Nucleic acid binder design. Structure first.
Ligand SMILES: [K+]
Ligand SMILES: [Mg+2]
Ligand SMILES: [Mg+2]
Length: 155
RNA sequence: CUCGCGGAUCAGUCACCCAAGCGAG
């Protein structure tokens, strides 16, 4: 199948639930989806964050499926707040360009399409961070549109 | 070169990748 990349950010508390004991959960997920998934090592954060990186390679549908499973795990946290309803994605600068559009018309449309709140990082690597927030179903739809833009691009 | 075994150290619900050492083409 036509393969695409999706890079998503993983809060440290969420990583163990993703990989699983012995790696059983991340292996089973790769098996079920066909996607290849690799995490950064534990203290290997994305510049400017406390978050590990998840590189996923697969069909569009696998990308979407794998993301949702990450979001489900992220939704479960309670160590003893805003981050439980966030998604963060790392996109190439050219696809961020496409996510934004002329005078920001595409991101407005993406937010109007979803019920999600979508931001990007300004211009501080040739990647930008896309932050999506809203309820689960809003975020999912937003993430679907974003993967659609990842798909629509000669990178 | 590449692959197979292996699994130092890191990690730690921590996999994949990656060291020593070994094997094969
Ligand atoms: K190996
Ligand atoms: Mg091995
Ligand atoms: Mg090896």
């Amino acid at each position: 199948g036509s393969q695409y990349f999706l890079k998503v950010l993983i809060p440290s508390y969420a990583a163990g639930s993703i990989i699983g004991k012995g790696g059983q959960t991340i292996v089973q997920l790769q098996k079920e989806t066909g996607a290849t998934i690799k995490l950064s090592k534990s203290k290997d954060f994305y510049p400017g964050t406390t978050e590990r990186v998840c590189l996923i390679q697969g069909t569009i549908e696998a990308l979407n499926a794998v993301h949702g499973f990450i979001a489900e795990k992220i939704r479960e946290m309670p160590q003893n707040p805003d981050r439980a309803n966030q998604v963060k994605i790392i996109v190439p600068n050219s696809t961020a360009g496409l996510i934004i559009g002329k005078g920001g018309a595409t991101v407005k449309a993406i937010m109007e399409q979803s019920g999600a709140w979508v931001q990007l990082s300004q211009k501080p690597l040739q990647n930008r961070v896309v932050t999506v927030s809203g309820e689960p179903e809003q975020n999912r739809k937003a993430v679907e549109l974003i993967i659609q833009k990842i798909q629509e691009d000669p990178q």
